Amino acid sequence: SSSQVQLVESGGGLVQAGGSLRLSCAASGFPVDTQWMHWYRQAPGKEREWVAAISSTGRSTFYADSVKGRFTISRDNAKNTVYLQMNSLKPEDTAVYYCTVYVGNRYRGQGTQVTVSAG
Amino acid sequence: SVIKPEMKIKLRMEGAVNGHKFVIEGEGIGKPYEGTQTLDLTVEEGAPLPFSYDILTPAFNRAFTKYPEDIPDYFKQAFPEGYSWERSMTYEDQGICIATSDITMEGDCFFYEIRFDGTNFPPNGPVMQKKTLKWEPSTEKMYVEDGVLKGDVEMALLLEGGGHYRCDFKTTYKAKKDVRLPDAHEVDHRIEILSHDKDYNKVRLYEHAEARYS
Numbered sequence: 001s002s003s004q005v006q007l008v009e010s011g012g013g014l015v016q017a018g019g020s021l022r023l024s025c026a027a028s029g030f031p032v033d034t035q036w037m038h039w040y041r042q043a044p045g046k047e048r049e050w051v052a053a054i055s056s057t058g059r060s061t062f063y064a065d066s067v068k069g070r071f072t073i074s075r076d077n078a079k080n081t082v083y084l085q086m087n088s089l090k091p092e093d094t095a096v097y098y099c100t101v102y103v104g105n106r107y108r109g110q111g112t113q114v115t116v117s118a119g
Numbered sequence: 120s121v122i123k124p125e126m127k128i129k130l131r132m133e134g135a136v137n138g139h140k141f142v143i144e145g146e147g148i149g150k151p152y153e154g155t156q157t158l159d160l161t162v163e164e165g166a167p168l169p170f171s172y173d174i175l176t177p178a179f180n181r182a183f184t185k186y187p188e189d190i191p192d193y194f195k196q197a198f199p200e201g202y203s204w205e206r207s208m209t210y211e212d213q214g215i216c217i218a219t220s221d222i223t224m225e226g227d228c229f230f231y232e233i234r235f236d237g238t239n240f241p242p243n244g245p246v247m248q249k250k251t252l253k254w255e256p257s258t259e260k261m262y263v264e265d266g267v268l269k270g271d272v273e274m275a276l277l278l279e280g281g282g283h284y285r286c287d288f289k290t291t292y293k294a295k296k297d298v299r300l301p302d303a304h305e306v307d308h309r310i311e312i313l314s315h316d317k318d319y320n321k322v323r324l325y326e327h328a329e330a331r332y333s
Contacts, residue, residue, distance in 0.1 A: 036223050036230065053129075053230060056221065060131040060232040102199055102225075 005029035005107040012112030025082040025099035033077045041095035091118045121199045127228040134235030141165030154185035154329045160322040167318035171251040178218045185329040193268045196298035206290040214240040245284050251276045256309040268292040306330045
């Protein structure tokens with residue numbers, strides 16, 4: 001299964017409010033331009049929140065209403081990677097961020113942590 | 120099943136009609152097994168639209184169809200992988216439109232990526248003069264061909280004045296995986312704009328669809 005599809009996130013860490021952070025989701029086992037891909041985040045204790053989505057062709061992008069205008073999802077087909085550009089961060093954006101895809105089955109990354117400080 | 124009794128919708132449509140290019144985004148919800156859905160549509164680029172919004176609305180998902188148990192549901196079977204479609208719309212006055220949609224799902228929500236294109240609409244015809252009122256209810260004839268599902272429906276726009284503006288729909292529905300194929304049947308449609316603002320930048324759209332044999 002991990003020898004079928006792998007999603008590997010990276011780029012997280014800690015940053016102060018109003019800052020920037022650019023996550024990467026590197027895909028292996030399938031061409032990234034053949035599938036819709038989504039970003040989820042999960043704070044501890046609470047439920048998972050669908051963050052953003054990008055279409056197979058990359059001509060469509062969708063965002064949750066709680067991060068529109070600030071977050072941008074993009075894709076590089078040569079590197080086989082989905083990105084999540086995060087601007088104007090707020091302390092409520094604090095969660096572990098992972099990407100997900102469905103290629104015959106459900107695959108999911110291990111997630112990178114984003115922790116936003118107040119002030 | 121992966122198709123829940125209530126499913127949300129998100130869509131984005133990029134297109135051009137008689138040279139005027141636009142982008143419309145949509146948020147909605149419906150009951151797939153009842154054949155009823157409602158969409159809240161927003162013009163994001165190209166406002167105000169210089170053509171009749173009506174020609175776009177059948178492009179805004181046969182998964183919202185009430186299917187009898189004795190007819191295989193080509194569309195609900197295609198998920199979670201999903202399906203795509205391709206549609207030609209040939210109007211009686213040589214106006215012509217081409218549309219595609221790529222449909223998938225995630226959680227309790229469908230996603231669509233729609234492309235719409237039209238041209239050769241006469242400058243004084245109903246579409247360019249925004250003289251349409253509504254689509255009449257229709258019947259689509261579904262039938263299998265080349266291992267995929269096809270639909271034909273004769274459509275007609277009621278015009279300001281009482282006359283009708285007729286159009287020919289031909290669609291190809293391509294499931295992304297192997298599904299049980301039904302035999303020929305019919306889908307009854309009724310599509311309606313429930314409400315809108317002055318320039319149709321905000322539109323609320325409703326459709327009801329049920330499948331049956333002849």
